[PDB]
């Protein structure tokens, strides 16, 4: 069910994860305001989903849902022990904690993906 | 955890506060969805929403009704659909003509045009005194703006409409029965879209609304302020009946091209005053219970109810719209006490839309004596021991009727992408 | 096989019956696309559709016309586009004035306003008798509703418009020449955009339509039912010419602001009756052939044709829209026989759109004498041996004029994803 | 060409498969009803295509066109022999035959991808 | 190389100069964004665009202004938006009534019969109407011969707000930084822009007002100077201050018609009567005219140069016009243009204003109470080329488009199609 | 920055390549015309982008940004030396040169991916 594990721990909510991806697009859906005021909502939903998918595509993880990646986890981003978060806290608490440092992670992650793309294609383009 | 590595999870249950546009959804079963009920299928989705389910464990969210915004969207919807409904019908500008009247109901006669504009004929019709301003009279609207007849096929029947969330959002609900309107609610559940909301408009009471399963609730943003309006919810409804025993008649007079205008003809039979009946046994019991509950928040003072503030009749009188006719009933006898009944009433035809913003409307008369049966469920009071005890019925914005329902609900935006540490490695 | 595993293919060619909104694409070659031809570039794709190809092998699908979607979509589109075309211009309400007429054409004179509203002048104009209802007369429309002049820059000429399927659908066609309209057509082919369809309106016969390559076709739901209308496609067309030899004249009279109105002036020269000419040899040959064909479906009975059902002139007569003028021709001389010619005709200016649902129109008069040369291609009949032999031309619905061109066509929705078994492993 | 093998056998229509998937988006394409009545069609076409692509991506087959999967083919879903369909039937007939049991297959696949990536996640993370 | 293979790069920086529809972004700071400034938030993005940056190295492309897109889209936007603004108000059709007038020669005192709130009753009213708006003792309003007027009802303000034009998703805007750019030919100093600096959509004939200068000395622009028909557009190195006034202390009265549907008109002139005039500093004006003559002497080889009076014709074409606080001027420019290679100009005002393209609907600008001033910066001139005849220049105008094509000269629109194929040593 | 390497050589602008991919969708973004004329722009922005991604999907390179293939480079497509373009020419100059022959090489890749798909599919099928 949708949001069926919104309160469970990080180790339990990480199961499935297909319900949260299927809902973001699907649904039931003279000149009248109903027209424009529904088409705007639909186009915003599509654009948000495509920004998310593109952002996954830049990191090489498109097609996957759980995607390992090469970027160190500096302890300054989390003083809490890294084996405790996975069976104690809810995902919301994690978002509240780590929403501060997001753009640093994304900016570093782009270049860390480039250091898997460029070298692998220079394996033959330069060799 | 010796040296961990970033991992990216997509489709993860996190959310934020939101600002979006909700879709209505009617709940009709027949061609009434196409008969323009204002909120007909011409407005939004026909029918058949999904049920409401998915209780969530251990979640906590901090609701608020006075900072809420769903009521704002719906008020704008109300005004927009009202204007859209009144647009493609008359336009009673020819009636701003000198009326000669003689004798509540004045018998007015006036010159008007037949289908040929060069020819004219006399017509007579009975107009209610509040709609007339001076043996020469004119309609009140000509000083302010042009009227617009609420032409037939347009019914004010308050059908329930469900508010459903667009793609990519969700709606959260509070199940705590004693939820006073603010503070964290733990028994949270998800709803695809809300229970049936009857969009009535009324003043000094609530009609056909939603009760509360537990005992009488009292809700206000800041009771220490003497201006904030209380919105009470009764544990059990009180049955009310209203009638207009006069057997009216309607006559149609044509104006210019193919175009009609209905007006009240002659009163067949005897004349009687439109009234309202409220069961006094239930009413006294409920008033006593509300007095008992109010005594908690104000520390051990006496509490009394007194006559309304007065002023404009719309603000100073309870007002129905049922049966296609607008009432204005006096509530003086209804509020008298401390911690059956018959109410006299008067009706109007020229109606300014009760936000005080929409253009004037002419409600056409309806033939035959009309009855109307409702449920009183909530009260709108305002706080005035000799003076803190007195409570006055209150009247005001259209929103206050509906913030009485859209208080359990919250709109959350979901952004499912989360970064977590673990022993991953590519 | 021993053991198999699910496999997923994308882009599979499978379809389902669909229900969608079809675009419209014009076929213009000049500025006429922007000059409002009702179906101009203001409401359709400009021009140049693709060709039609991709015959399919071994396919079979069950067509049907009498429950097809395209005809209702086109009907609603036609009504909406027409209503949008007539709204911006006048507003002929000032002419609901007492007319003094004397003497087919009555010379009516009336008072009207000049550019200054406080001043008036007399004007005279000739109005056709069917548009007048009583030495004092008024227009027929003032009883019913306000008219709107078909202001200039609008041309009723039926240009061809191609219908096309939106993104993610396809159009299927029947190539079987003797396709009687129902049951599985095997010679199926795909189409991007339909062939040119002329959206003409014309009762009791068909004009400028599409023939059939093989011999005469006959179509109906259930010939055992006496009520349904037969639609016949002729193997070859017959040539018909219509004229209004009177050399009319138009005069413009102004009303209020810069808001004119044209009317028929005086008849220069001599007066003559508008008439239509049909070649009698071709008509007799075609009528004999259709009589020969009809004997197959009704077993070896005699067959005859008789005068129309009568009633309203529009139902009881054949009407065009030639040169911006509307005709009503008597077809009694045409249908007289068993298993040249001149037809008298009368014209109108006040036209209710022939659904009876569209709003009133005043077709402006056109100067000079009109000629109108057309190809008749199909007939509309209704089955009445002494009584089963007689066939009565009939009509009244504009839908049947178009269900004779959109009979070959069906709309399909692709379902590209499909699952199949084979040897596999991830 | 588009729909150029709608009648051929399953083994013959399995060739190409680019034209029947490339056409689902492309095409030629004052307030007026033309605007709303065209934008609604556009948005519906886009949303249908994105639902198809997302459904292919949940199963791990995004980017592919022919994609093997690990779900057994119980004989009860087809009594007709499994080596005869590939050279006798047409895809239309196959869709008519199997459309009864489709949601079972989709439900099985939507979980049999999480089971697939469970091993990869545990190998590359749990170690 | 020995043997190479195709490689596909996505995100390549290549472009094709194309066509599109660009948004409009306002630059407001308060509820003025919701008070109808014609081009308010009701038709444009609210405010706060991004800065303009990312200079590009070694780029070159051929610009052009006289076949640009942005001018036509701006013109259609202006026409459609203005028309949509004027619809939801009167409709002064009741005023096509026989006006009895008797004459200060500019203002005629007219009286007429009109309806009160009861249509069956009538009363007399009086108002002063300007003589150009009247056509003959009997008089009627000018518009009744042509079409119905439409009062520019209050809460709409004609003040030119700066609006930024921001390109939609996918496209981008390119700019010329060459200071002496003459409108055509390849500009090397290129820099992309997210969206345009503030453009004041003013309207004015025979001169330019409040527009953008050029940092270097005076520029001269045209299609083909060898052709005499084309209009020259000049950007001044520095502005010259201009002031316009209407010292008469007018008054406004309201007369009601039918339903609650008013109509304002000029009452009685309190005090004394004076003629509206404009003031231009003659020192700066002579200096600037001399400099423009010096510049124009270069393109036309070593001839004398002079300036003569306007071509004449319609007063709108033959006179500089304004929109100053809801009032429209028509000032004579004869004294300005007299020379070779302070000042006071008499002016007249109108109330019945046709769209100065001649294509929009009639408008009635309501009178504004109190004496009104209007302070502006002249920045560009519109001339046409007529040594005895090639020396004389004539101010010219009439087209709305030429007033904006002086400002959108630097800009171009590019479509990005970033998918590129290249050869290199590859194998899947 | 966007278009920050529009003038540099082919081997210099080949770095990053995500500024040009992250911009093609993102941005700031009563019945009125301003409503419709924005929705017409937005839907053409997303539909143009999906047509690019779908075109990389058939070529097998969806998810990738730099993607090798198996279609040889006939010298007739370019007489200029194939090791000189990568450090002398601007990407625009490359576009103007080889835009003539675009639909040939596109058509080959449309099948040269389906070719190896069949061999991969027939490895087990
Ligand atoms: C109202 O007055 C009219 C005279 O104009 C008269 O015919 C009619 O009977 C009166 N009706 C009543 C109810 O007094
Ligand atoms: C009219 O009055 C009678 C008796 O008062 C009542 O029974 C009836 O219901 C009334 N008419 C309607 C429509 O309610
Ligand atoms: C119609 O009557 C008018 C008189 O009002 C006359 O001048 C005109 O000649 C007449 N025309 C015809 C055709 O009888
Ligand atoms: C007018 O009549 C003449 C002779 O009947 C005919 O030749 C001509 O074509 C007619 N005018 C038009 C426009 O058809
Ligand atoms: C204009 O004429 C009216 C008479 O209708 C008079 O009352 C008024 O004073 C006059 N005003 C002026 C400025 O002459
Ligand atoms: C009115 O005139 C005086 C003196 O001419 C001037 O100072 C004042 O600014 C004028 N009024 C306005 C609103 O500018």
Residue numbers in the entry:
A (entry chain B): 497 to 525, 543 to 640
B (entry chain A), C (entry chain E), E (entry chain K): 31 to 132, 152 to 184, 190 to 309, 312 to 321, 321B, 322 to 354, 356 to 394, 412 to 459, ...
D (entry chain F): 521 to 549, 567 to 664
F (entry chain L): 523 to 549, 567 to 664
Authors' description from the paper:
Here, we determine structures of antibodies in complex with HIV-1 Envelope for all observed members and ancestral states of the broadly neutralizing HIV-1 V3-glycan targeting DH270 antibody clonal B cell lineage.
Based on these two early intermediate resistance features, we selected Envs from days 358 and 526, having both G300 and long hypervariable V1 loops of 18 and 28 amino acids, respectively, and Envs from days 836 and 949, having both N300 and short hypervariable V1 loops of 11 amino acids, to identify structural hurdles to DH270 antibody interaction. As the principal effect of the LCDR3 mutations was rigidification of the LCDR3 and closer contact with the N301-glycan base, with little change to the bound state configuration in the unliganded or bound states, these mutants likely enhanced the interaction by compensating for increased epitope flexibility.
